[PDB]
Design an enzyme around this catalytic site. Sequence first.
Site, PDB file in Angstrom:
ATOM      1  N   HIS A   1       0.862  -1.188   0.000  1.00  0.00           N
ATOM      2  CA  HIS A   1       0.000   0.000   0.000  1.00  0.00           C
ATOM      3  C   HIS A   1       0.897   1.237   0.000  1.00  0.00           C
ATOM      4  O   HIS A   1       0.567   2.242  -0.643  1.00  0.00           O
ATOM      5  CB  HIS A   1      -0.915  -0.008   1.217  1.00  0.00           C
ATOM      6  CG  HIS A   1      -1.760  -1.243   1.307  1.00  0.00           C
ATOM      7  ND1 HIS A   1      -2.766  -1.522   0.401  1.00  0.00           N
ATOM      8  CD2 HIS A   1      -1.685  -2.320   2.125  1.00  0.00           C
ATOM      9  CE1 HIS A   1      -3.266  -2.722   0.646  1.00  0.00           C
ATOM     10  NE2 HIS A   1      -2.623  -3.226   1.687  1.00  0.00           N
TER      11      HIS A   1
ATOM     12  N   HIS B   1       5.583   6.714   7.060  1.00  0.00           N
ATOM     13  CA  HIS B   1       5.309   6.298   5.675  1.00  0.00           C
ATOM     14  C   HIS B   1       4.877   7.521   4.866  1.00  0.00           C
ATOM     15  O   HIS B   1       4.671   8.607   5.419  1.00  0.00           O
ATOM     16  CB  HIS B   1       4.220   5.230   5.605  1.00  0.00           C
ATOM     17  CG  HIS B   1       2.926   5.649   6.230  1.00  0.00           C
ATOM     18  ND1 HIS B   1       2.624   5.480   7.557  1.00  0.00           N
ATOM     19  CD2 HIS B   1       1.854   6.278   5.685  1.00  0.00           C
ATOM     20  CE1 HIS B   1       1.415   6.004   7.764  1.00  0.00           C
ATOM     21  NE2 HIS B   1       0.921   6.493   6.644  1.00  0.00           N
TER      22      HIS B   1
ATOM     23  N   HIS C   1       2.568   9.056   1.252  1.00  0.00           N
ATOM     24  CA  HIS C   1       1.472   8.940   0.301  1.00  0.00           C
ATOM     25  C   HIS C   1       1.939   9.887  -0.804  1.00  0.00           C
ATOM     26  O   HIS C   1       2.397  10.998  -0.502  1.00  0.00           O
ATOM     27  CB  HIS C   1       0.193   9.469   0.902  1.00  0.00           C
ATOM     28  CG  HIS C   1      -0.295   8.647   2.039  1.00  0.00           C
ATOM     29  ND1 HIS C   1      -1.070   7.519   1.881  1.00  0.00           N
ATOM     30  CD2 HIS C   1      -0.108   8.792   3.371  1.00  0.00           C
ATOM     31  CE1 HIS C   1      -1.333   7.037   3.081  1.00  0.00           C
ATOM     32  NE2 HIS C   1      -0.775   7.769   4.017  1.00  0.00           N
TER      33      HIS C   1
ATOM     34  N   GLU D   1      -2.703  13.815   1.196  1.00  0.00           N
ATOM     35  CA  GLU D   1      -4.038  13.399   1.592  1.00  0.00           C
ATOM     36  C   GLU D   1      -4.757  14.655   2.057  1.00  0.00           C
ATOM     37  O   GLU D   1      -5.853  14.952   1.610  1.00  0.00           O
ATOM     38  CB  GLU D   1      -3.921  12.357   2.694  1.00  0.00           C
ATOM     39  CG  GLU D   1      -3.143  11.141   2.226  1.00  0.00           C
ATOM     40  CD  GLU D   1      -3.600   9.899   2.934  1.00  0.00           C
ATOM     41  OE1 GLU D   1      -3.321   9.756   4.148  1.00  0.00           O
ATOM     42  OE2 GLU D   1      -4.240   9.076   2.256  1.00  0.00           O
TER      43      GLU D   1
ATOM     44  N   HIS E   1       3.688  10.819   6.927  1.00  0.00           N
ATOM     45  CA  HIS E   1       3.005  10.592   8.195  1.00  0.00           C
ATOM     46  C   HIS E   1       3.933   9.882   9.175  1.00  0.00           C
ATOM     47  O   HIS E   1       4.449   8.794   8.863  1.00  0.00           O
ATOM     48  CB  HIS E   1       1.750   9.742   7.998  1.00  0.00           C
ATOM     49  CG  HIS E   1       0.683  10.407   7.170  1.00  0.00           C
ATOM     50  ND1 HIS E   1      -0.300   9.689   6.538  1.00  0.00           N
ATOM     51  CD2 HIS E   1       0.459  11.726   6.966  1.00  0.00           C
ATOM     52  CE1 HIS E   1      -1.087  10.583   5.971  1.00  0.00           C
ATOM     53  NE2 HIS E   1      -0.670  11.816   6.205  1.00  0.00           N
TER      54      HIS E   1
ATOM     55  N   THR F   1      -6.085   6.944   7.737  1.00  0.00           N
ATOM     56  CA  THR F   1      -6.545   7.203   6.398  1.00  0.00           C
ATOM     57  C   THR F   1      -6.564   5.937   5.570  1.00  0.00           C
ATOM     58  O   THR F   1      -6.789   5.998   4.369  1.00  0.00           O
ATOM     59  CB  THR F   1      -5.719   8.276   5.717  1.00  0.00           C
ATOM     60  OG1 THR F   1      -4.373   7.819   5.617  1.00  0.00           O
ATOM     61  CG2 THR F   1      -5.782   9.634   6.501  1.00  0.00           C
ATOM     62  N   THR F   2      -6.227   4.798   6.178  1.00  0.00           N
ATOM     63  CA  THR F   2      -6.317   3.515   5.482  1.00  0.00           C
ATOM     64  C   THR F   2      -7.140   2.600   6.390  1.00  0.00           C
ATOM     65  O   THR F   2      -7.259   2.850   7.599  1.00  0.00           O
ATOM     66  CB  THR F   2      -4.955   2.846   5.238  1.00  0.00           C
ATOM     67  OG1 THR F   2      -4.283   2.688   6.484  1.00  0.00           O
ATOM     68  CG2 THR F   2      -4.104   3.672   4.315  1.00  0.00           C
TER      69      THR F   2
END
Length: 257
Positions: free
Chosen positions: A61, A91, A93, A103, A116, A195-196
């Site tokens: 992911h 991690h 995004h 995000e 994040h 957010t996941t």
Amino acid sequence: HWGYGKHNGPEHWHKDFPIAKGERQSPVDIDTHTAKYDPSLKPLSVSYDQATSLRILNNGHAFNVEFDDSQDKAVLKGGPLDGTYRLIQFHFHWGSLDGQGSEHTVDKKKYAAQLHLVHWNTKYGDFGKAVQQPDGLAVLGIFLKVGSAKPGLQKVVDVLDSIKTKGKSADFTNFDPRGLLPESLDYWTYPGSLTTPPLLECVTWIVLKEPISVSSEQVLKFRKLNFNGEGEPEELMVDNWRPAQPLKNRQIKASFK
Ligand SMILES: CC(=O)Nc1nnc(S(N)(=O)=O)s1
Ligand SMILES: [Zn+2]
């Protein structure tokens, strides 16, 4: 299972995780004009000098750099927080193009990526218990814009070749997360969620006002990662971000005016 494609993307998540349509979902758009300056908010206290990184992993992911959270060696406190929150992993995004990837958005503006730094409230004993509480996690969010290279991100950029596909991991010791911080620690804060999936509403979001810049070649490397496992058809890991969610009955507080 879940992912970011059209058939398993964010629009489909509610079917397996009903909380996707909850009251304190993240990310959100930060409207700088309705955000409330709150002078009772304290400065953030980031103590990462004893941080111990262990491994980098492609989980299919995104990619995570994990830290040893068996003791208070890399912690976050102050700000809107009570108690100590331990760093467990960070991690990113990112997008397929430089104009998307973050995000959170600021006045509808999207950044190239979003970092994040995930922390859990030590009063709960372990990460698994903390995600079950309204004040369980504190995630520090940092926007990335394309410009000059971020020296402190190169070590991460160079190891990606070794974790190209899902399930791959690599030793990643002696990485200092302090090299990813912007100069100013001013921020906006609001109560939200992961957010996941499972999208638990256990996060106090702390989003820094100042973006760090990375070079185009640095972000390019991120985009070479694969969602798929080795030996499977190549699916480039890009656009692993969830769109902004309704703010509903929440206020975004700012630590600066
Ligand atoms: C182990 C862990 O940190 N789990 C997370 N899942 N989603 C997260 S995010 N995008 O809200 O920071 S963190
Ligand atoms: Zn994240």
